[PDB]
Amino acid sequence: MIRAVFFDSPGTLNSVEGHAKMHLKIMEEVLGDYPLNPKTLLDEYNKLTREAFSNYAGKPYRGLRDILEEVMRKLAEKYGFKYPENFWEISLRMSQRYGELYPEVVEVLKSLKGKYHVGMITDSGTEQAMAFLDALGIKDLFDSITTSEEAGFFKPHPRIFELALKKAGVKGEEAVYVGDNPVGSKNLGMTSILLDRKGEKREFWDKADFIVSDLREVIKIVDELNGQG
Numbered sequence: 001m002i003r004a005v006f007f008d009s010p011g012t013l014n015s016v017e018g019h020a021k022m023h024l025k026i027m028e029e030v031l032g033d034y035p036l037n038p039k040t041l042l043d044e045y046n047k048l049t050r051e052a053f054s055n056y057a058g059k060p061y062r063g064l065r066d067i068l069e070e071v072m073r074k075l076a077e078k079y080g081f082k083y084p085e086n087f088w089e090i091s092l093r094m095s096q097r098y099g100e101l102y103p104e105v106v107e108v109l110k111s112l113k114g115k116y117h118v119g120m121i122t123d124s125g126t127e128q129a130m131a132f133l134d135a136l137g138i139k140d141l142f143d144s145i146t147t148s149e150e151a152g153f154f155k156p157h158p159r160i161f162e163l164a165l166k167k168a169g170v171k172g173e174e175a176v177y178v179g180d181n182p183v184g185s186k187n188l189g190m191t192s193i194l195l196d197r198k199g200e201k202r203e204f205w206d207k208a209d210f211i212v213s214d215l216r217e218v219i220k221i222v223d224e225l226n227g228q229g
């Protein structure tokens with residue numbers, strides 16, 4: 001039976017509303033008075049980060065800060081502005097100010113806790129993951145927190161899922177994974193629930209076992225899988 005529910009963090013938990021304008025403001029802070037359109041810088045940054053994230057999926061862990069600093073070094077060299085030595089801190093300030101959970105998250109996590117193992121699985125480094133959970137006040141809502149840094153590899157490499165299952169003491173067939181962007185979990189027998197809040201991730205629909213738009217649907221799926229629907 002299903003004894004554990006794992007959440008893809010931060011994707012299933014943290015709102016992305018307004019993030020494009022937040023990232024535009026980061027680029028404005030990088031540039032200052034430099035005569036480059038911040039939207040042009042943002043678009044080029046997003047191209048390079050897309051490339052990097054595609055490259056690193058399934059590969060050994062590398063720190064995000066190192067990756068993003070490399071991207072910014074390349075862009076500063078390309079466009080002629082001074083490399084922002086504090087780019088990471090500029091970005092972190094933005095994420096601290098505007099981090100915000102989706103409105104149903106806390107009650108869903110509390111509804112599952114104690115009845116099922118409630119786990120978090122993330123590609124974030126461990127320090128970043130813990131700081132995220134603490135900033136949003138939900139660290140104690142998880143029974144396990146499993147990172148790419150601990151496993152050694154980024155999703156969708158199976159090691160991170162194997163480690164999460166071992167921490168919980170459950171088999172894959174006893175677990176659900178709620179995912180935001182599953183390029184993985186099913187290699188280990190886990191049941192996959194894709195969270196698609198806007199009904200826009202059709203490239204992931206067909207491999208998912210279930211698709212939901214709101215995490216309150218997760219409870220109802222787990223109940224059904226356990227014969228209590």
Ligand SMILES: *CC(=O)c1ccccc1
Nearest residue numbers: 019022023094095098099
């Ligand atoms: C990217 C960005 O500005 C952000 C990310 C997470 C939380 C808040 C803001």
